[PDB]
Structures are given as C-alpha cells and as structure tokens.
Design a protein around this ligand. Structure first.
Ligand SMILES: Cc1cc(/C=C/C#N)cc(C)c1Nc1ccnc(Nc2ccc(C#N)cc2)n1
Ligand SMILES: Nc1ccncc1Br
Ligand SMILES: Nc1ccncc1Br
Ligand SMILES: Nc1ccncc1Br
Ligand SMILES: Nc1ccncc1Br
Ligand SMILES: [Mg+2]
Lengths: 415, 556
C-alpha cells in the first residue's frame, strides 16, 4: 500500500533497449492484454518525455488462446540496485533438488497487487509496435510491480511469506522456493498426493486474491530423475587403429580434467603406419593403462566447488538425431553438472526449436540447484537464434547467451 | 466563444546536473533589428512568445536570415546550446513505413495542420530556458527580452512533443473510424479510405470538426497535394508505388565521391528493381576515405554498371499488400556472395525486391549464405507485414536435409519449396562418418621454423607411399594445410587422412566451399573430385606412429 524506495545503480541510466519486430498475432495479443491492464490500473500510457524502453513479446500454450505477456527486463535487472536491506539474499534451499517432485507455478500475477515506487516507474517503459510502423507505437509504463523484474519478488517477499503461513507449519517437509515469477514446490509425496497439495497451495493464493490467468498451471519436475554424464571408455574385443586413435584423443582431453590419466602405453600402439581399419591387438602394458584409466574416471573431479560470486556457464553440443549434450561450470574443466537430452518433443525437423527447449530445461535445472541462471554458449549463428527463439519460448525468465562460431572438437568426447 | 479543450503540456527537463544556456547575443545590423522587432511583435500578438524582464539569466542567440529573392526578413533562433542540455525524448519517427506494407486505397486526401504546431504549448517551467534578446539600436537601451510559450522551431523537443500531441488528438478519431487510415507528416495529415466518394468526404469533414474541438483550424481551400505523392524518396500512387527517378550519370572518370553516390542510388533502387548488384562498385571503396581521389573502374565494375543500366532502363512499380493472401519470397544466387530476392503474393507483380551481401569472412559456403539471406528477409518481412513469407529457394529438399542434419550448428529455415532455377545451391563435398575399408591411409604433418619461416609438409601411408616437400616463407598453420593438400593430390578416389592439426580440422569441419586462403581453396578443389574422404584427428606429439614418423620427417 506504501511504496518501497528503489533506485538504479550509481552512474547507471535507465534502459534504452530497442523493441524487436513482432508478428501480427503477438501485436494483437499485446494490444488486448495492455488495454485490460490499463483498465485495471496496472499500467499507464506515457509521454515522449520518457526516453526509456524495454522490449516486450508474448508466449502462449498451443491449446490456450490465452497469451502471457513477457517483458524482457534483462537490461533493467542489470541496472537495478541489489537489495540487501532486509536480507543479504535467499539462502538457496539445497534440499529442493532432492525432492521426488517439484511443481513450478507462475505466481507473478500476485505481484500486481503492490504499487511501484513513483520515481522508478519510468524505467519500466515499453512499446507495443504497429505492423510496418504505420501508427505510432503505444507507450506504457508500470504502476505496480511488473512480472519479470528482479525487484518484484524482493519487494513482495514480505507479503509472500505471510501468505504461505498456513501452508508453513501444516506441511513442514515441503520446501518452497521463489525465483522471479516462479514458485517451486518440492515434496516426496505420491504424485496424486503431491498434486492435491499443489492445489492446496493455489487456494491460499486465490484466497489472498480476494483473477490470476495462469496460476492453475503446473509444470512438474522430478529432480530425482535428473541424470549425469561420467566419462566412459568403450569396452571392445578388437580395436582398430581408428578406435585406438579416438580412445587416445578422448583420454588426452580427459587428462585435462583428471590428473592421473596416462596414454603412453596406448600411444605406443599407434607406432606404425597401418591402415585405419586394421585391428591391432592390445599389449598388456596398454591393457593395464586402459584399466587404470577406467578406474580414474570412476571418481569425482578433484577440487570442484560452487562459488556463488561467479557466473555459471552452460555449453551445449548438437549430437544429432535429436540428442543434445551440455555442461555447466564456472571454471574450465571443473564441471558442476553434465547431462544429455533426447526427448525434444514436437521438433524432429527443427534444430532451433530443440535447442530452445534445451536452453529452457538447463536453465530450470540451474535455478533448482543453485538458484540462478547460467550464461549460455550456443552452437548457432546469432541471426538464426535471434530470429526464432521467441517462437518456442515457454518460460517467464530469460537467461543470457553468447554464440559459438567455431566447431568444438570436444563434441566428439561427449558423444 | 466556443470552449476548446487545452492541449496538455509535456513536462520537460534539462539533463542531470546541467543548467540552461547563457550564450552571447552577437550585435546585429540596424537593418536586422527593426525586422526582428516587427517579426516578434506579430508572434507576440499571436501568443507564440512573451516579453520577459531582466531577472531571467538565460540566453540563446537570435539571427536574421532572409529568403533569397524577397525583402521580408525571417528570424532564426539558434538553439544548439539549449539542445545540448535538453533531456532525451522518445523518438517515434525512427521507423518509417515501407510502401510495400501499405494497403491500396481508393482515395487519399491531405489536410493542412500548420495551425497546430504553434498552438502546442511549451511546459511552463521550461520556458525560461528559451530566452532570447533582440539587440537594441546602437546598444543604447536594454535589448528586448522574450521567451517562448510554444514549441520553438529548431528546439530538440519540438518534433517528439508535437507528434505525441497530434497522436493524442487523432487517436480517438481513428479508433472510432476504423474504415480510414491516418498518417501525419510535419504539417500535413493524410487520410486514406476505400469508401465511396460519399462517406469519404464526410469522414474528412468529421475530422475537421474533431480538430476544431482543440481550436485547430484547417484551410477550406482544399490541398495542393493529390496522388501521386513524393515522400521519403518514393512515389506513392493509389494502387502502386515506386522509388523516385533513379538516373545513373554518364561520366568518363569516377571520383571517390561520385562512386559513393552511384552505390547509394543503386541501393535505393534495389528495393523495387530486381537484380541490382553493387559488390564490384562498392569494393572500389575499400579502406580509402580520400573524398575526391579518382579511381579507375575495373573491368568488373564496368560490367556491373552496364548490368545495372539495363535494369534501370524502364520504370518498375510495386503493388501494395493484400492481407488476405500469403506472401512469397524468392531468392537467387548472383555470385561473389551476392543474393537477390523478390517478395510477391500474385505472379509477376512484386511488392518489393532486395539484395543480401555475404559478410566479411575467412571461409564460407553457399548454404550458410542462403540461410542468412533467409533470416534477413524473414526479419524484414516481420517488420513490414507482421508475418513470415513462404520461401522459394534454389536448393533441393535433399540437399537441405543432408546439410542441416549433419551440420555441427543448430540451423533452421521456415516453410519453403524448391524452385528449379539455376544456379542451384548444392553440397560440393561431404566427409565420411567412418573410416574407409580398402582406402589408403595418409598420415600427414607439417611444421615450420618460427624464426626462419622455413618448413616442411608431407605424408606417409600404409602402402609405404611417402612425400616431404620443403617450403619457404610459411608457418605451422600453412604447413599443416599443405600436408593435407599433398595427401589429397596424391591419393586415389577414396582416402583416409590422419592429421594432428586442430586448426585444419576447425576449418574443414566448417564445411567451406570458398575461402580467402588460396590453400584452403586448393584443398576444396581436391575434395570435390574425390568419391570418399575420411578425415581423422589425433593429438600431436603423443607417440602416434605414422604421425610421429612424418612429424620426425617434416620437423627436421
Ligand atoms: C504511411 C502513409 C503515408 C501517406 C502519404 C505520405 C506522403 N506524402 C499516406 C498514408 C495514408 C499513409 N498511411 C497508410 C496506411 C496504410 N495504408 C496506406 N496506403 C496508401 C497510402 C498512399 C497512397 C497514395 N497515393 C495509397 C495507399 N497508407
Ligand atoms: N510459462 C507460461 C507459458 C505459456 N503460457 C503461460 C505461461 Br505462465
Ligand atoms: N506452463 C508453464 C510452463 C513452464 N514453466 C512453468 C509453467 Br506454469
Ligand atoms: N494515434 C493514431 C492512432 C491510429 N491511427 C493513427 C494515429 Br496518428
Ligand atoms: N571472403 C572472401 C573474399 C573473396 N573471395 C572469397 C571469400 Br570466402
Ligand atoms: Mg605437428
């Protein structure tokens, strides 16, 4: 009811980010959405004395006709003060990633109940463009906490705990975690018992509301299901020259991650100029070396530790046939997580759709485990990605990304 | 009097930490001063400015310039200093409509709205920063001090405040009259419709009546402007559009500056004239910036210009957008990284055309370029029409499938069909995924001395074939490529090649069909005449014999 004071960071001006081209269907959707929001006091039209801008688009489920407004606040979130006034932050719940079920809810609609500081509103300016710029873009700013902005969960956090206060002591084993517009609710209970308690939670929020367009949704994860990718070497009865070459290449790379890995005795087998397809019998010294290497690869990487002060970096490789590998790290060769996907649904002839879904799944894994999104290195040309990723995006947040333009030779080793 | 609703002020600020201007008023000839006094008396009478006292500490210089061939002066207030201090505004006119996205209209009438610009009030708290001084005759009295009450000609905030004030006025009219379009351009209003002459003229009068609500009068004597309109370099007709005349000059010698004008005209023409090319004429500009250096035109630049002249020989027009019909985009390869395209909905009547130019790169191929051209057309089409066109591409469906499924990057192009119009985009080689049984295996290596630039490149094979070539003025990267070239040159139609060059693998795994390096080009030519090539990588200096043997040979 009374606004919390909020500032930009020192020497930083508000965002002035270009609005990118929108399809006719998204413009129509946003014109209806914003008309309703202005009617309900959430946003107001602004004048030309406001030079700021953040881009907007919209996403929807294929079977919904209801669109979700998505403001891309990445720049504003960078330029907004970090609030350590009431808490230095959230001690990220390490037990969340251990629950047999975690349901993801969009609770961002609750944010609209809190007014935004009157001096800060101008920095939330956005524009609804017109096809072919035939009419001037419609300019608005927010009067209330906007979804997608870093400040909204912080300022609303005092109210959010006070709404979960019946769920608090009634279900003391449920871990609840908030990230941007998302609420993560973890439990070890049977899937039917889990869902009832999810709907249990929804009512507490709809109760407080007295309507939220998307709180009824529920994306269900099973972090207990989440798999890893250790380094494994082939088990063969006969090795060609080529097989041994690729083994020593793989071991060469792995020696950058694992110290005791040796390739001396195996390299010695490549002594000679034989046909690539000739079978070479394994010497016993090479047999020993291979076995010792296999046992090294069974252990964890040494000196691996998460530091919350550093960025997370995520790399992705296209392996073909709808398969994608990825690694999350902070320092090179100190992987905090590796994985592999194949279940890219509804995209057997669209690489970019698959990569986009991979990016979203990796980001939600990162949010669950460390409470923050990674910076992606994407194996795609910038113009291809920028033209299409908003057509397949289904999440309420957006990570940062850069583009890889030279083929990694290590793609071979995560195969 | 009839009450008129006021036009509400935009609050305006100076930039943080900055103050208003305090700039010298230079002395004026006695002639200029009397003219400015009469000028300012009429503007003061009409309300545009007001006399102020001497407390206001700000000042902006005023000048007297007058129209050639006349005798009634005009006032120029030079707001350069105040503009440096005025806050930034939202600029809306940055994105200009493209004619190919417009809709056909039966009638387009023009209204004069010059009266409004000077009735748009300036924020009261900002007016003090607009102060100016008419110098006194012989400088024997205080100069006459004025400030603006309205948006001044030449001030930084006037275009964006004027436009947003007109938008607010016109908004409800347009919203309650969805059978017309309205567009404002300076002191002109354009209203188009498909109505019968009847309701169209009535709609015009309603608009005049609506404007009168704010006291904005429009002239009764109807406008000088009638279609076709000359606007932003185009000629707009009711049912078609084109660019304004594009006349390529006859010249014997061509200057840096003259070629820069030639290229600009060609770029402007290429949005409706199909097949325009500028690569050779633009590459007469490489790095140089001596605005008047004379450049000889290469044999290529002359063939390109002659090509362009024949294309500009007759006028060509585009049609407007029909939202009830699909958009089709067709792309052709032109050579030397140049691509050309047409966008249409009906056969033989283009909405617009265009071109795409290959980026500066070291290695490239046609499929990558075609892909980038498609992404460019797609984004331009979203801007102009709000939707992606259906594509007609000169690449077989088989070729594309082979490309994207094996390419190391994720890649995508939207709904498209093959069009069989040469030259077709194709894959010139494809590397094997497995080693070839029965094919000779070449273990290649090169090395170069960093100080002498002497090197060697060569191979050894499983058949005992060997070669080492001494090389001058080379590097390790060049010698590793040379070794791969020698293996290709000396092998049969199927070959396994083993290298330790991470550098060479990174190039070949990018699948180029053309390079800046003549050595990569030589390798590409060799790859094209093979039936099967398997390229295998292994780590250097680990003990890999064959690799170790030719490494011992080339590093001696
Ligand atoms: C951008 C624009 C510039 C001018 C005029 C600019 C100037 N000077 C006039 C109008 C009415 C518009 N706005 C729109 C909007 C949608 N379709 C059209 N079609 C359209 C416009 C002109 C002619 C003609 N002749 C035919 C069809 N115009
Ligand atoms: N995350 C979402 C995706 C699609 N529609 C709505 C929401 Br909320
Ligand atoms: N519909 C959704 C999609 C993705 N995450 C969360 C929700 Br709820
Ligand atoms: N403000 C407007 C709304 C619709 N058409 C034109 C204008 Br100007
Ligand atoms: N970048 C280039 C320049 C000239 N020819 C080929 C290429 Br590839
Ligand atoms: Mg070497």
């Amino acid at each position: 009811i009374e606004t919390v004071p909020v500032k930009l960071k020192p020497g930083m001006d508000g965002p002035k980010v270009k609005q990118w081209p929108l399809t006719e269907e998204k413009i129509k959707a946003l014109v209806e959405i914003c008309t309703e929001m202005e009617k309900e006091g959430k946003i107001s039209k602004i004048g030309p004395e406001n030079p700021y801008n953040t881009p907007v688009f919209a996403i929807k489920k294929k079977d919904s006709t209801k669109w979700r407004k998505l403001v891309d606040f990445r720049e504003l979130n960078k330029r907004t003060q970090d609030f350590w006034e009431v808490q230095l932050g959230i001690p990220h719940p390490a037990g969340l990633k251990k629950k047999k079920s975690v349901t993801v809810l969009d609770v961002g609609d609750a944010y609209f109940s809190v007014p935004l500081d009157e001096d800060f509103r101008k920095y939330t300016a956005f524009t609804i463009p017109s096809i072919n710029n035939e009419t001037p873009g419609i300019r608005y700013q927010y009067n209330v906490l906007p979804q997608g902005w870093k400040g909204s969960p912080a300022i609303f956090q005092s109210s959010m705990t006070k709404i979960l206060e019946p769920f608090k002591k009634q279900n003391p084993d449920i871990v609840i975690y908030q990230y941007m517009d998302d609420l993560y609710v973890g439990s070890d209970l049977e899937i039917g018992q889990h869902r009832t308690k999810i709907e249990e939670l929804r009512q507490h929020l709809l109760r407080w509301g007295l309507e939220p367009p998307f709180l009824w949704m529920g994306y269900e994860l099973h972090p207990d299901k989440w798999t890893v990718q250790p380094i494994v070497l082939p088990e063969k009865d006969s090795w060609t020259v080529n097989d041994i070459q690729k083994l020593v290449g793989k071991l060469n790379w792995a020696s950058q991650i694992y110290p005791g890995i040796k390739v001396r005795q195996l390299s010695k087998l490549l002594r000679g100029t034989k046909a690539l397809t000739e079978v070479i019998p394994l010497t016993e010294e090479a047999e020993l070396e291979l076995a010792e290497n296999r046992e090294i690869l069974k252990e964890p990487v040494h000196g691996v530790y998460y530091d919350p002060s550093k960025d997370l970096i995520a790399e992705i490789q296209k392996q073909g046939q709808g398969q994608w590998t990825y690694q999350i790290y902070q320092e090179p060769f100190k992987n905090l997580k590796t994985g592999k996907y194949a279940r890219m649904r509804g995209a057997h002839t669209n690489d970019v759709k698959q990569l986009t879904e991979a990016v979203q799944k990796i980001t939600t894994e990162s949010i669950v485990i460390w409470g923050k999104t990674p910076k992606f290195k994407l194996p795609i040309q910038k113009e291809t990605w920028e033209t299409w990723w908003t057509e397949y995006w289904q999440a309420t947040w957006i990570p940062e990304w850069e583009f890889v333009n030279t083929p990694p030779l290590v793609k071979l080793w995560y195969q | 009097m009839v009450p008129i609703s006021p036009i509400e002020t935009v609050p305006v600020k100076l930039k943080p930490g900055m103050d208003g201007p305090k700039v010298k008023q230079w002395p004026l000839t006695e002639e200029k001063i009397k003219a400015l006094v009469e000028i300012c008396t009429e503007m003061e009478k009409e309300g545009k400015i007001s006399k102020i006292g001497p407390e206001n500490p700000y000042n902006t210089p005023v000048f007297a310039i007058k129209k050639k061939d006349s005798t009634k002066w005009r006032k120029l207030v030079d707001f350069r200093e105040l503009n440096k201090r005025t806050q930034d505004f939202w600029e809306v006119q940055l994105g200009i409509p493209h004619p190919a996205g417009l809709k056909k209209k039966k009638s387009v009438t023009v209204l004069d709205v010059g009266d409004a610009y000077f009735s748009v009030p300036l924020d009261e708290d900002f007016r003090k920063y607009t102060a100016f001084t008419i110098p006194s005759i012989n400088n024997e009295t205080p100069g006459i001090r004025y400030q603006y009450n309205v948006l001044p000609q030449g001030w930084k905030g006037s275009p964006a405040i004027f436009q947003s004030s007109m938008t607010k006025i016109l908004e409800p009219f347009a919203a309650q009259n969805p059978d017309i379009v309205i567009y404002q351009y300076m002191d002109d209003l354009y209203v188009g419709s498909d109505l019968e002459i009847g309701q169209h003229r009535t709609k015009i009068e309603e608009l005049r009546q609506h404007l009168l609500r704010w006291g904005l009068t429009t002239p009764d004597k109807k406008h000088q402007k009638e279609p076709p309109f000359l606007w932003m370099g185009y000629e707009l007709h009711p049912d078609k559009w084109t660019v304004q005349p594009i006349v390529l000059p006859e010249k014997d010698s061509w200057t840096v500056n003259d070629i820069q004008k030639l290229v600009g005209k060609l770029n402007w023409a290429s949005q409706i004239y199909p097949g325009i090319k500028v690569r050779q004429l633009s590459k007469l500009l490489r790095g140089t910036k001596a605005l008047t250096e004379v450049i000889p035109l290469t044999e290529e630049a002359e063939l390109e210009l002659a090509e362009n002249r024949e294309i500009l020989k007759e006028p060509v027009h585009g049609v407007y957008y029909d939202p009830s019909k699909d958009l089709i985009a067709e792309i052709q390869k032109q050579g030397q990284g140049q691509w050309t395209y047409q966008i249409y909905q009906e056969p033989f009547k283009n909405l617009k055309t265009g071109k795409y130019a290959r980026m500066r790169g070291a290695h490239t191929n046609d499929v990558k370029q075609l892909t980038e051209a498609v992404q460019k057309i797609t984004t331009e089409s979203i801007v102009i029409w709000g939707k992606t066109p259906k594509f007609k591409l000169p690449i077989q469906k088989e070729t594309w499938e082979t490309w994207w499924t094996e390419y190391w990057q994720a890649t995508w192009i939207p709904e498209w069909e093959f069009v069989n119009t040469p030259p077709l985009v194709k894959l010139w080689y494809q590397l094997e995924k497995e080693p070839i049984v029965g094919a000779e295996t070449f273990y290649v290596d090169g090395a170069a001395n960093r100080e002498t630039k002497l090197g060697k490149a060569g191979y050894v094979t499983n058949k005992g074939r060997q070669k080492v070539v001494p090389l001058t003025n080379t590097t390790n990267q060049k010698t590793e490529l040379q070794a791969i070239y020698l293996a290709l040159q000396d092998s049969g139609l199927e070959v396994n090649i083993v290298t330790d060059s991470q550098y060479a693998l990174g190039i070949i795994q990018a699948q180029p069909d053309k390079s800046e390096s003549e050595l990569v080009n030589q390798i590409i030519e060799q790859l094209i005449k093979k039936e099967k090539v398997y390229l295998a990588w292994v780590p250097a200096h680990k003990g890999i014999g064959g690799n170790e043997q030719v490494d011992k040979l080339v590093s001696a």
